[PDB]
Curated annotation (Swiss-Prot), chains A, B:
Lineage, highest ranks first: Bacteria, Pseudomonadati, Pseudomonadota, Gammaproteobacteria, Pasteurellales
Predominant localisation class: membrane
Protein name: Macrolide export ATP-binding/permease protein MacB
Taxonomy, superkingdom: Bacteria
Family as reported in the entry's similarity comment: Belongs to the ABC transporter superfamily. Macrolide exporter (TC 3.A.1.122) family.
Keywords recorded for this protein, A-Z: Antibiotic resistance, ATP-binding, Cell inner membrane, Cell membrane, Membrane, Nucleotide-binding, Translocase, Transmembrane, Transmembrane helix, Transport
Function statement: Part of the tripartite efflux system MacAB-TdeA. MacB is a non-canonical ABC transporter that contains transmembrane domains (TMD), which form a pore in the inner membrane, and an ATP-binding domain (NBD), which is responsible for energy generation. Confers resistance against macrolides.
Organism: Aggregatibacter actinomycetemcomitans
Residue spans, topological domain Cytoplasmic: 1-256, 503-531, 587-600
GO molecular-function term, one example from the UniProt record: ATP hydrolysis activity
Phenotype upon loss of function: Mutation does not produce a noticeable phenotype or alter the drug resistance profile and the hemolytic activity of A.actinomycetemcomitans.
Pfam families on file: ABC_tran, FtsX, MacB_PCD
Gene3D superfamilies: P-loop containing nucleotide triphosphate hydrolases
Length: 600, 600
């Protein structure tokens, strides 16, 4: 019976005193397959009514029903169908996508309908033939005249062959020839049973309509008919969406490259400060560990034998000293010290080999008369001359100098040599990883298991092992809070550049919604636009930092940038989960507001 | 004679095969004060010629002369004058600024002319009266119909009363009433001696012209006259620019807030990592310094007296030991050690006061029999009981226990007590700031100045003083390269958000250029927009970090975030010098391209 039925239609804009009554109790039924012209004075409400009909706006009050179905009660996808297949909208200001060619702009409504791309380009091209722009099918909107852009808009409206054609001043910018041809087209679609509702100011145009409504001040003045009326009788979706996203990204080279370089940094920063931090910790903790060791002085040799058979004890020394008199040259250095020490004593106290060698196993087994010299008691006795080989005399008893060591007269001989050839404790080096007060109570246990009840007045020096654990806690807090900054820094960095760049195309959404796209079709390409730009700039990131590391480890002597694979994951899994969230969120808020509101 | 003289005018677009010949050897003289209508088929070259006349485009070849002056040879400011005062341009697609009201859009050309704002709003309002939009003077473009926007465009063209009025389809979107009124206006300006060149498609409109030119395919077909023709007879600048910048900033709340929060971070990051870094260095270097001191053992008392009178020597100790036997209870600890030490020895070796007191001056002056105990030789002798007061017996000679100290049987008495009451070197503490091998050769000098030629076999331990200087160099590199990152991070952060947000209004520039603004008038508000948004987000920055510091120093036990005033300056002077450079650069590249090219 009727195709459109608008009863009691009201429409307001604005917020009193800024509010205006724009459509005033409009009641209009349009007959199926009619040709209708709407005329009126500039700013009377004509475009506003056209939008509510084609489901771009929605009225403040009153019913509007397409094929008798109330539009407000329809679902958001149900509406997006009407806009793809029921309506075909020629916009007043033509609303083309500026990055697309003419042809591409025409075919676009037919992606959301889901026709194969080979068919689209040929049809779109034929629509531009019929309308006179077969010449310009490759031109983008801003390479066309206004009247050309207008005809591209007309083409697009005709692309999905919608039953109803809403034409809002479709000849405004065109000569009478071009304008007639366009009327020719519209007339033929009327003849093929389409329904035409056309806003116009030119009367010659309005004559091609059988019905002519006049609007003034939001109300309906005229209603004229020449005759009576005739009676009436997601898988590929994503392949396409991906293609959309890519050309979208290539079209906006700047926005894209900056967005992606935004994420690149918010990775390489976080990663390069985690790896700078752990590199300087290695060196700082090492500079401390090399200042002296941590040991437990027990102040027989089978005790110190099995003491050395742990993994929580790294080295062991039997100890025994001697107070006596040395001789070299004429000089006779009185009250010298000959420390009878173990195989591994130079490990246990971390003394470093300067010159020659240290006490081998053969020397302690044979009670060899060989002495390793203290740096200070080496230079004093031998001036600046090689002391290797040359002899000393401790208590009228020769000793062959076999090497020199670091500091903390001191002389180091085997314990077997001092208990055999000079006179007749047990120190252990507690491991770096094991806990200090654990081992103080692990050694109490493990030795008392060798019966002897005492004297376990066991002393142990562990102030290095303290100020390591003390400065590892400080270096953790530093690296941890520095990473937490640099991460929050370049997450906001991404959010800014993302929030801007996507909201910068909320009109592009409003167009896509008006020409048939369904809510989710938006979210498809805007997710794909994000992930595609996020996991390129991710890959760029992880391997840009790598290159920085190589540059740093090359030029930097002091410490090495040592990476963490945990940070790499964290930084990437963060900087994309944030960039995708802020690529989606704004696109989704756009696609869900009324197309016209998006269009401004 | 003539006002416009166009000889041999050619015009191409595009790059073969994409290039098109669009204006073909056009020769057109227009007579001063004429009323001219240009007609033609859609896309024949009409708008293109209109732009070259009004100095928005420039021709590929051939002359174009306004009042006989060749336009290409004019200077860029000379052109910006013509656009403010010679021409008044009604654009085809109306090209309003969307953030301005109707009135504001109309007056804008008259800021660059430099009329007082009180006069502008009243005139702009009157132009909107004459054209029918006195009702809507507060509406922004996107609160108007197309025909309303059109009339706002017309108003603006008439605002500077330009002699020539280029009107590109100025009735396209308006009813015959509104359109006639507009023709009424244009006719009256013709009557007041203005010159009118008007592109149109409507003939009734073209009849109001005395001359009617037809263009087709870039060439001139018709030329008709009804009659012959009549013969012809920076200081405030910145105040305004500032106002422009502010409303501009308030209009773009998002772009602005993000840009400014962009700089906020690129300060607070750099500053919080400099201050985290120096805080953790303080603690790490302290944890090292407290592990032991650096000293120079000289191994009489007036020597050690004047040795202590330096600022490169912090404390001094006379030294003398004793090997003997202690007694408490029945127990009799054999070969104990009684170190005869100085006033300040517990400073010199950094031993810390546990319990009671240390050797006062009165004790060393009186040779007091009082002993300070080693942590270990205190606990061993007195189990877990207070040893303060209670007596020991070193070599059948009482000693009153006066306190306890840290470690590195050991007993500490005055040197005067051991050289008087027990038996009958000089150690110095080299200062933290002075260099170590300097003082080794400053003490050689300063003591030999006390005659004595030797024995200056002076030893000194300074491995702490090494591993501080060794880890200050490592902590410098860390803080230095971490600051260098976080700084480059949030300079690019600013550049991105700035580059985007300003290039996002290159059309706004192209409009402003077409309506009279001079090149520098652009740079004025875009500098002011930057500095105004940069030195707000700077202030926000310096005092956001301050608040973070207070939060950190509150909750964090371990080390304190200690700020640098050098970083604060660096970070601010960087993040604004970069943001201003990238706020200016793009605006300036826009303002210097042809207005039409900017308009797309
Ligand atoms: N950047 C460009 N690249 C290629 N071609 C262009 C470019 N700019 C304009 N053109 C072409 O030059 C011609 C200029 O036509 P013009 O803008 O004068 O149209 P018009 O006569 O004003 O149309 P209408 O009557 O609808 O207003 C157009 O046909 C257009 O295709
Ligand atoms: N967001 C808004 N706020 C306030 N007023 C608005 C808003 N949107 C539209 N209007 C007003 O509602 C009216 C709608 O008019 P409409 O868009 O139908 O003009 P039109 O008849 O199409 O004009 P033309 O004939 O020139 O195309 C306008 O007069 C406009 O001022
Ligand atoms: Mg309209
Ligand atoms: Mg035009």
């Amino acid at each position: 019976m009727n195709i459109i039925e608008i009863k009691q239609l009201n429409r307001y804009f604005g917020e009193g005193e800024n509010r205006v009554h724009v459509l005033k109790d409009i009641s209009l039924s349009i007959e199926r397959g009619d040709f209708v012209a709407i005329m009126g004075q500039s700013g009377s409400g004509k475009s506003t009514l056209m939008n509510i009909i084609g489901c771009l706006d929605t009225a403040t009050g009153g019913s509007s029903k397409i094929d008798g179905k109330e539009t407000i009660e329809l679902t958001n996808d149900q509406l997006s169908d009407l806009r793809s297949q029921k309506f075909g909208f020629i916009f007043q200001r033509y609303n083309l996508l500026s990055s697309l060619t003419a042809a591409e702009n025409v075919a676009l409504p037919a992606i959301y309908a889901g026709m194969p791309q080979s068919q689209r380009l040929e049809r779109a091209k034929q629509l531009l033939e019929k309308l006179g722009l077969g010449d310009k099918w490759q031109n983008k909107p801003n390479q066309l005249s206004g009247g050309q852009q207008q005809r591209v808009s007309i083409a697009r409206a005709l692309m999905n062959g919608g039953e109803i054609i809403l034409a809002d001043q479709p000849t405004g910018a065109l000569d009478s020839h071009s304008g007639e041809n366009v009327m020719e087209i519209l007339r033929q679609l009327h003849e093929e049973g389409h329904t035409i509702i056309m806003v116009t100011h030119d009367k010659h145009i309005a004559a091609s309509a059988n019905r002519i409504i006049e609007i003034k001040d939001g109300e309906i003045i005229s209603d004229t008919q020449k005759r009576q009326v005739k009676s009436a009788v997601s898988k590929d979706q994503l392949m396409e969406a991906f293609r959309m996203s890519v050309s979208a990204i290539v079209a906006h080279k700047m926005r894209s490259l900056l967005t992606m370089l935004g994420i690149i940094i918010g990775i390489t920063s976080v990663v390069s400060v985690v790896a700078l931090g752990n590199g300087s910790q290695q060196k700082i903790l090492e500079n401390i560990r090399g200042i002296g060791t941590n040991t437990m002085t027990i102040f027989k040799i089978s005790d110190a034998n099995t003491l050395s058979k742990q993994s929580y004890i790294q080295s062991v020394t039997p100890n025994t000293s001697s107070s006596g008199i040395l001789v070299v040259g004429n000089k006779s250095f009185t009250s010298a010290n000959l420390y009878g020490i173990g195989e591994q004593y130079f490990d246990v106290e971390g003394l470093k080999l300067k010159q020659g060698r240290l006490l081998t196993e053969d020397d302690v087994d044979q009670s060899n008369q060989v002495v390793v010299l203290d740096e200070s008691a080496k230079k004093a006795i031998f001036a600046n001359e090689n002391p290797l080989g040359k002899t000393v005399i401790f208590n009228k008893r020769p000793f062959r100098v076999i090497g020199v060591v670091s500091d903390q007269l001191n002389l180091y001989s085997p314990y077997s040599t001092v208990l055999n050839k000079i006179t007749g404790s047990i120190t252990v080096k507690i491991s770096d990883d094991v806990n200090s007060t654990v081992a103080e109570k692990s050694l109490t246990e493990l030795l008392k298991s060798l019966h002897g009840k005492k004297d376990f007045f066991i002393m142990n020096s562990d102030t290095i092992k303290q100020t390591i654990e003390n400065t590892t806690g400080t270096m953790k807090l530093l690296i941890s809070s520095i990473a937490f900054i640099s991460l929050i820094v370049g997450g906001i960095g991404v959010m800014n550049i993302m929030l801007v760049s996507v909201t910068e195309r909320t009109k592009e959404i409003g167009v896509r919604m008006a020409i048939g796209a369904r809510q989710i079709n938006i979210l498809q390409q805007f997710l794909i636009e994000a992930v595609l730009i996020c996991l390129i700039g991710g890959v760029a990131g992880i391997l840009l930092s790598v290159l920085i590391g190589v540059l740093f480890n090359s030029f930097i002597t002091d410490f090495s940038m040592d990476f963490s694979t945990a940070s790499i994951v964290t930084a990437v899994l963060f900087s994309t989960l944030i960039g995708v969230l802020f690529g989606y969120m704004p696109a989704k808020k756009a696609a869900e507001l009324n197309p016209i509101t998006a269009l401004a």
